[PDB]
């Protein structure tokens, strides 16, 4: 490419393969955040950490 065309700069040709964590990172991080939030709830109410697994699930 002897010129830097902005149309050619912005058009997704498809040569960028997404990563392994690209479709899966946000649901597993939000699930870990939810499990940790339920753990933190059970810790602050002086329960066992893995006592109520209904809240965890």
């Amino acid at each position: 490419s002897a010129v830097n065309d902005p149309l050619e700069l912005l058009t997704n040709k498809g040569t960028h393969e997404p990563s392994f964590l690209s479709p899966i990172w946000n649901p597993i991080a939000c699930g870990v955040a939810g499990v940790g939030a339920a753990i933190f709830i059970n810790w602050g109410f002086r329960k066992p950490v893995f006592s109520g697994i209904q809240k965890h699930i």
Binding site: F45, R46, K47, P48, S51, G52, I53, Q54, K55
Partner: protein, 368 residues
């Protein structure tokens, strides 16, 4: 307040009693359930009173049986030293520091001049507070009145009795006065009080009617101390309460009988104080609307952690009520690692509780 005999039988409720120990009453629960649909002439707070030894427990139980009321005995320190699993925490004192050791009523009687005794007096007031809301949860939510063996209003006289005898300093008196000014204004004054008047010597004779060892080998039960309680009661406390509650004073030198004490209650007209809306008698217990009744029931059911968190005041100038930080950490690692209080009392696997894997319920107004 009609008794069992004039009513023709057992008391019938005016409506269904609210499960206040199981269902949480809040603002959104106040629409469907109303407070004043259960109130009647029997829905009044009666506090029996008196000196150290006056037969308050048997007389209060008989008054609860005859008037169809709930009996509430005087709170002792076995409510927190013995937890919900029955483990007494008085056996933890070798591991605990000497400023963090167990101190109960018999420890006051054997050692009056100890520092933590002042703490004990403050602790007793909190325990009385911890039953009085439990009194006011019973009157407002179910509609059945209660009888109290002693009152949180009736506990500053014990503080001044220790102070004039020399068991408390000026600092502990100022601290307990500050907690009383912080906390007593949120309570409703009782409807009726019964004081069992006794002389200073005869109570000592009633000490020999009990024959317990720690109250006969002690030092506090003397002539000046019981006279100090009698003077404090009859010159400050009953005169302060008689502007709100109908006071009944009986002489209890003899054995007495609870039926004439019942029959003096129905001779009192409780509707004569409702003619004036600014009357000092029954002022805290009158409510012009159903929404004010539900407002008080919300304050006394959903805001019991509020009234228990009003005790969090800072006072560091005294050296009797300040726990050392190394002693505090040692006390935490002994007391909270003990069997029966490692976790919340529902979820304790060490004491045989089963089904913890699917349990997510907690107690309403429960000490953690």
């Amino acid at each position: 307040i009609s008794g069992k005999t004039m009513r023709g039988g057992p008391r019938v409720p005016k409506a269904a009693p609210y499960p206040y120990k199981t269902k949480k009453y809040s603002v959104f629960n106040a629409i469907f359930d109303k407070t004043s649909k259960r109130f009647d002439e029997n829905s009044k707070v009666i506090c029996v009173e008196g000196p150290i030894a006056a037969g308050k427990s048997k007389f209060a139980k008989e008054l609860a049986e005859e008037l169809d009321m709930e009996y509430y005995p005087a709170v002792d320190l076995d409510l927190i030293y013995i937890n919900s699993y029955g483990y007494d925490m008085r056996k933890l004192d070798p591991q605990l520091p000497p400023s963090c050791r167990s101190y109960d009523v018999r420890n006051f009687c054997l050692d009056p001049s100890h520092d933590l005794a002042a703490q004990f007096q403050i602790r007793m007031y909190m325990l009385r507070y911890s039953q009085y809301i439990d009194a006011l949860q019973h009157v407002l939510s179910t509609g059945q009145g209660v009888v109290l063996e002693r009152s949180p209003y009736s506990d500053f006289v014990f503080m001044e009795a220790m102070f004039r005898q020399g068991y408390l300093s000026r600092g502990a008196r100022s601290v307990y006065n500050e907690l009383r000014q912080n906390t007593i204004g949120e309570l409703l004054k009782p409807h009726l009080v019964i004081y069992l008047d006794l002389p200073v010597d005869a109570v000592k004779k009633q000490i020999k009617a009990r024959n317990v060892d720690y109250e006969v080998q002690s030092k506090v039960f003397s002539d000046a101390y019981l006279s100090d309680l009698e003077q404090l009661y009859k010159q400050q406390y009953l005169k302060d309460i008689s502007t709100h509650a109908e006071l009944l004073i009986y002489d209890w030198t003899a054995g007495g009988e609870t039926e004439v004490v019942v029959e003096d209650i129905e001779r009192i007209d409780f509707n004569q104080f409702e003619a004036d809306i600014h009357n000092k008698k029954m002022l805290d217990w009158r409510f012009p609307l159903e929404a004010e009744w539900c407002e008080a029931r919300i304050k006394y059911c959903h805001e019991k952690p509020d009234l228990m968190n009003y005790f969090n005041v800072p006072r560091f100038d005294v050296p009797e009520l300040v726990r050392s930080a190394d002693d505090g950490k040692v006390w935490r690692d002994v007391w909270f690692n003990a069997p029966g209080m490692k976790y919340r009392p529902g979820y304790n696997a060490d004491m045989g509780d089963e089904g913890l894997l699917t349990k997510t319920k907690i107690g309403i107004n429960q000490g953690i």
